[PDB]
From a paper:
Within this class of proteins, the bromodomain and extraterminal domain (BET) family contains four members that are transcriptional coregulators and that recognize acetyllysines (AcKs) using a tandem pair of highly homologous bromodomains (BDs). Despite heavy academic and industry investment in this area, the generation of paralog-selective inhibitors has proved elusive because of the extremely high sequence similarity between the bromodomains of family members (90 to 95% within the acetyllysine-binding pocket residues). Using the highly conserved BET BDs as a model system, we conducted three mRNA display-based RaPID (random nonstandard peptides integrated discovery) screens using a single library (which contains >1012 unique members). Crystal structures of 13 distinct peptide–bromodomain complexes revealed highly diverse structures and binding modes among the cyclic peptide ligands.
We also solved structures of another lariat-type peptide, 4.2C, bound to a BD1 and a BD2 domain. In contrast, 4.2B and 4.2C are members of smaller families that are detected only in the BRD4-BD2 selection. In line with this observation, 4.2B and 4.2C showed significant selectivity for BD2 domains over BD1 domains. Surprisingly, however, the helix in this case runs in the opposite direction from the other two structures. Together, these structures demonstrate that the class of lariat peptides that we have isolated is predisposed to take up helical conformations and that such peptides can bind BET BDs with affinities that are comparable to those observed for β-hairpin peptides. A helical scaffold appears to be particularly favorable for BET BD binding and, strikingly, this property is independent of the direction of the helix but rather a consequence of the ability of a helix to juxtapose a set of side chains to engage the pocket region.
Numbering used by the authors:
A (entry chain D): 1 to 15
B (entry chain A): 65 to 190
Write the structure that this text describes.
Amino acid sequence: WKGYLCLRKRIQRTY
Amino acid sequence: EVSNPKKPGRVTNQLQYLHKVVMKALWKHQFAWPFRQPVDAVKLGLPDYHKIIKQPMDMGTIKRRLENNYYWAASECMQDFNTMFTNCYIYNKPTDDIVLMAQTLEKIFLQKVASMPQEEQELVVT
């Protein structure tokens, strides 16, 4: 929810 | 990685317990979504992940392995779970948010494993 890797992981999830 | 024709696999009571009880409890957890797929180092811009982590592992890979009877014994499957948790701890900082999600899943993992059948026994279809 705040980390670079976790947010980048979250962006790719919506794709 | 997921399938191997030259390596023997088995169905045991402990392996089916990991697939029916342990995996289903961790898979639907709210913190499970980062661990359901292999880490895509290209999409996430991680040029050092595969050079620090020598054996990637995710819940999706473990689940496919149980569904294909990849493992011979439960110890091989529990090593995959440990490998997945260790990769998150090594690569990330101990204070990272993704590490707290892995530790939450690891405690649940150790909780479910504590109720696994004590002795491993092979399951043969008749």
